[PDB]
Design a protein around this motif. Structure first.
Motif, PDB file in Angstrom:
ATOM      1  N   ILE A   1      62.229-107.228  27.477  1.00  0.00           N
ATOM      2  CA  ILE A   1      62.886-107.890  26.228  1.00  0.00           C
ATOM      3  C   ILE A   1      63.873-108.628  26.275  1.00  0.00           C
ATOM      4  O   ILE A   1      63.961-109.930  25.194  1.00  0.00           O
ATOM      5  CB  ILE A   1      63.286-106.588  25.551  1.00  0.00           C
ATOM      6  N   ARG A   2      65.100-108.640  26.819  1.00  0.00           N
ATOM      7  CA  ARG A   2      66.159-109.581  27.237  1.00  0.00           C
ATOM      8  C   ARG A   2      65.531-111.489  27.423  1.00  0.00           C
ATOM      9  O   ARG A   2      65.852-112.558  27.039  1.00  0.00           O
ATOM     10  CB  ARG A   2      67.344-108.987  28.319  1.00  0.00           C
ATOM     11  N   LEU A   3      64.538-111.021  29.229  1.00  0.00           N
ATOM     12  CA  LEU A   3      64.150-112.163  29.729  1.00  0.00           C
ATOM     13  C   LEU A   3      63.545-113.222  28.513  1.00  0.00           C
ATOM     14  O   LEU A   3      63.016-113.916  28.494  1.00  0.00           O
ATOM     15  CB  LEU A   3      63.636-112.100  31.015  1.00  0.00           C
ATOM     16  N   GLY A   4      62.537-112.133  28.199  1.00  0.00           N
ATOM     17  CA  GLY A   4      61.711-112.451  26.750  1.00  0.00           C
ATOM     18  C   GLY A   4      62.329-113.710  25.893  1.00  0.00           C
ATOM     19  O   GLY A   4      62.108-114.361  25.426  1.00  0.00           O
TER      20      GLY A   4
ATOM     21  N   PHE B   1      54.390-110.775  28.862  1.00  0.00           N
ATOM     22  CA  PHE B   1      54.117-111.427  29.884  1.00  0.00           C
ATOM     23  C   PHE B   1      55.279-110.959  30.759  1.00  0.00           C
ATOM     24  O   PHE B   1      54.580-111.387  32.067  1.00  0.00           O
ATOM     25  CB  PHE B   1      55.117-113.329  28.726  1.00  0.00           C
ATOM     26  N   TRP B   2      56.762-111.275  31.109  1.00  0.00           N
ATOM     27  CA  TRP B   2      57.137-109.953  31.598  1.00  0.00           C
ATOM     28  C   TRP B   2      57.109-108.891  32.434  1.00  0.00           C
ATOM     29  O   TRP B   2      56.489-108.884  33.631  1.00  0.00           O
ATOM     30  CB  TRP B   2      58.800-109.902  31.652  1.00  0.00           C
ATOM     31  N   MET B   3      56.234-107.978  31.594  1.00  0.00           N
ATOM     32  CA  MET B   3      55.970-106.476  31.830  1.00  0.00           C
ATOM     33  C   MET B   3      54.123-106.634  32.398  1.00  0.00           C
ATOM     34  O   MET B   3      54.445-105.747  33.519  1.00  0.00           O
ATOM     35  CB  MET B   3      55.678-105.971  31.040  1.00  0.00           C
TER      36      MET B   3
ATOM     37  N   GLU C   1      51.094-106.400  37.330  1.00  0.00           N
ATOM     38  CA  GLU C   1      50.676-106.937  38.366  1.00  0.00           C
ATOM     39  C   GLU C   1      50.745-106.898  39.112  1.00  0.00           C
ATOM     40  O   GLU C   1      50.275-106.581  41.123  1.00  0.00           O
ATOM     41  CB  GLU C   1      50.166-108.409  37.939  1.00  0.00           C
ATOM     42  N   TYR C   2      52.566-107.122  39.755  1.00  0.00           N
ATOM     43  CA  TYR C   2      52.960-106.568  41.261  1.00  0.00           C
ATOM     44  C   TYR C   2      52.741-105.207  41.656  1.00  0.00           C
ATOM     45  O   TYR C   2      52.638-104.747  43.161  1.00  0.00           O
ATOM     46  CB  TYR C   2      54.564-107.667  40.902  1.00  0.00           C
TER      47      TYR C   2
END
Lengths: 91, 93, 93, 92
Positions: D52-55, D64-66, D71-72
């Motif tokens: 949420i903070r990066l987004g 997008f981040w999650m 996937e990692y």
DNA sequence: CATTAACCCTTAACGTTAAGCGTTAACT
DNA sequence: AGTTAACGCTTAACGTTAAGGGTTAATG
């Protein structure tokens, strides 16, 4: 009217004495998420725990246990209470 | 003396006192026959949904059954790890 | 877009749809009993490993599951202290 | 298939592109310096929070981040466990 | 019948393991 | 300063032992 035995540990023994869950299980000689999950209102008070808890904080064992049974009992009622008088009205 | 299982009470003060039976007592509470018996045999405990059922049926404060269980439970955690606990924990004193 | 545990998806689209239990599915995935029962009760989450066993058995992409868990955690985080987080961070514009 | 830590992403296509350094990022996000750096170094992942903070900061979906971390996480479970799970389970 | 030993499902409590935090104190 | 140990706290996921509970059967 259902008060978790947890809320009571946190809101008054931990907070009063400024002890952490991590430090408490260290004293009680039980693992970390043991004391933590009871604090979070996710675990209940075993009788092995009410012996530890009462020993430490200088209280009677049943005190925790009866804190539990009022929580457990409150929760069976209001889940199924009226759906039990409509089931068993006898004497 | 200390450990006394809530069953021992259900026999001796309620069944034995009313010429009632377990299969009889299952029917009233509207639960299965193996649950009333296993309490009475002293191989099962009182749950809260139980103690509400016995509470209502024997005109009893539900808090009385859970207390019979409350203690019988502590009784056997002491005497199983009682001396263990008292050695591991030093009070806040 | 709102908070739905993935466990809700598991019973409402799969368990009930194919008439399987928590206990039965867990045996089919080779995990212990509460590892599947806890997900169903909306009390545990879909781990990668769990999301891959779920994929295989129910012929779905594992991503499917991991995104029901993605959404659930996001929605949990936001509102828990989103807005607030929006109210601490200027972006680059 | 191939695993790609979300750090690699935030570094290569985010922190190198916009000349931001880790300990800078940590600040704008109102988070401690070791979270952002431990995420860059590929030794910690993106919590639902961090996303949420990066987004927010980078005008992208916290999704997008999650999803990078979805996937990692998957590619890392598979391979380390991929085969024997397909072998000990039978579908319908 | 009334009582039981069979199972099976679900589910609470426990110790482990390990991942995200911030805090501090190093280093670079 | 930026980078990163290395602390300690919290908290998620797991297998596990074991409890209550209703099926059913076997018994008496």
């Amino acid at each position: 009217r259902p008060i978790h035995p947890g809320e009571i540990l946190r809101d008054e023994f931990l907070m009063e004495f400024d002890i952490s869950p991590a430090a408490l299980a260290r004293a009680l000689k039980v693992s970390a998420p043991t004391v933590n999950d009871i604090v979070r209102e996710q675990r209940g008070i075993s009788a092995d725990m009410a012996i530890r808890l009462g020993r430490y904080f200088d209280t009677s064992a049943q005190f925790w246990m009866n804190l539990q049974s009022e929580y457990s009992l409150a929760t069976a009622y209001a889940a199924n209470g009226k759906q039990i008088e409509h089931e068993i009205e006898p004497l």
